Amino acid sequence: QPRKKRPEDFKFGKILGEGSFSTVVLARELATSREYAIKILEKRHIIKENKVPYVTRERDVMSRLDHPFFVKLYFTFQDDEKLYFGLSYAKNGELLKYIRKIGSFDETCTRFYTAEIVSALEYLHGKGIIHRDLKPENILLNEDMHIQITDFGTAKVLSGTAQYVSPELLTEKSACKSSDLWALGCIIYQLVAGLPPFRAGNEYLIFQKIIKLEYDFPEKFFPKARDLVEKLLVLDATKRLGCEEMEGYGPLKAHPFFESVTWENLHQQTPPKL
Ligand SMILES: C[C@@H]1CC[C@H](C(=O)Nc2ccccc2)CN1c1cc(-c2ccc3c(N)[nH]nc3c2)nc(N)n1
């Protein structure tokens, strides 16, 4: 393995993402001219805020993932004050930005991007890993406009954001592969409608709607997409299409909404123009 890298090995540029506990900055490695999204964490802050388990979890999950639809962790290093994680740079930023920019996706684009998300979850779940906070904000787009999923601090390894929270969190404080499938249902809805299905004035009211399954479809909603969303946004987590009790990804990928999809080499296909 190559030597440990250090801050002086890079020219840092613009901020790519910001949170309460870390910041992601674009960096060019001087020796190679390669660009990375370097996530920078202050050790003292992470300790004082008791976030060590989330940082450790992200580092451990993002190392293990070897699939084109995920941001990869390439290296780590530290100085006196900070931890640095070298991540895949997804040049086109968040899926959320595209939804805001174009309003809502047509059916060809909805189908393609939903298929990539499904294929990514199939990989992740096949490794016994659940994301637990999947959303358009952490589904990134690379230079070629394929997805790259990131932000793995909340991931669970098998022995979140209000709008996408599954009912089992609100009623049981629990989560399973099926929680990611609920998030998928919300995301498909948001691609088609242009807005998340559970919306309200404040977090409390959103939670109220989720536990009552209080949402509805706009008239312009692709009917096959509507049927799919209805088979994902189900209160009983064991009855969501894609979950183990529903016999997994086979029946999900076979849904009529995906009729024209070739599943085998999505990463090799040219995405539809947005
Ligand atoms: C800072 C940001 C928001 C907060 C989140 C958090 O703190 N979550 C959390 C907090 C507490 C506990 C658990 C989880 C961590 N976030 C990110 C951002 C990116 C990222 C962004 C842009 C990129 C680009 N253009 N190419 N690559 C990129 C990679 N990658 C990871 N892994 N995490």
From Swiss-Prot:
Residues annotated with Phosphothreonine modification: 270
Subcellular localization is given as:
Cytoplasm; Nucleus; Cell membrane; Cell junction, Focal adhesion
| Tissues and organs where the protein is expressed, per its UniProt entry | Appears to be expressed ubiquitously.
Ranges where the record places region PIF-pocket = 41-85
Give the top-rank taxon of the lineage listed in the UniProt record for this protein. Answer: Eukaryota
Q: Which residues carry this modification: N6-acetyllysine?
A: 220
Induction text: Stimulated by insulin, and the oxidants hydrogen peroxide and peroxovanadate.
Record PTM:
Autophosphorylation is inhibited by the apoptotic C-terminus cleavage product of PKN2. Angiotensin II stimulates the tyrosine phosphorylation of PDPK1 in vascular smooth muscle in a calcium- and SRC-dependent manner. Autophosphorylated; autophosphorylation is inhibited by the apoptotic C-terminus cleavage product of PKN2.
Which stretches make up the Protein kinase domain?
10-258
Active site per UniProt: 133
Q: Which positions bind ATP? A: 20-22, 39, 88-90, 94, 137, 151
* Sequence similarity: Belongs to the protein kinase superfamily. AGC Ser/Thr protein kinase family. PDPK1 subfamily.
* Summary of the function given for this chain in its UniProt record: Serine/threonine kinase which acts as a master kinase, phosphorylating and activating a subgroup of the AGC family of protein kinases. Its targets include: protein kinase B (PKB/AKT1, PKB/AKT2, PKB/AKT3), p70 ribosomal protein S6 kinase (RPS6KB1), p90 ribosomal protein S6 kinase (RPS6KA1, RPS6KA2 and RPS6KA3), cyclic AMP-dependent protein kinase (PRKACA), protein kinase C (PRKCD and PRKCZ), serum and glucocorticoid-inducible kinase (SGK1, SGK2 and SGK3), p21-activated kinase-1 (PAK1), TSSK3, protein kinase PKN (PKN1 and PKN2).
Assembly state and interactors? Homodimer in its autoinhibited state. Active as monomer. Interacts with NPRL2, PPARG, PAK1, PTK2B, GRB14, PKN1 (via C-terminus), STRAP and IKKB. Interacts with SGK3 in a phosphorylation-dependent manner. The tyrosine-phosphorylated form interacts with PTPN6. Binds INSR in response to insulin. Interacts (via PH domain) with SMAD3, SMAD4 and SMAD7.
Q: What is known of its domains?
A: The PH domain plays a pivotal role in the localization and nuclear import of PDPK1 and is also essential for its homodimerization.
List the protein's name.
Answer: 3-phosphoinositide-dependent protein kinase 1
Parent-protein start and end of this portion = 73 to 358 of 556
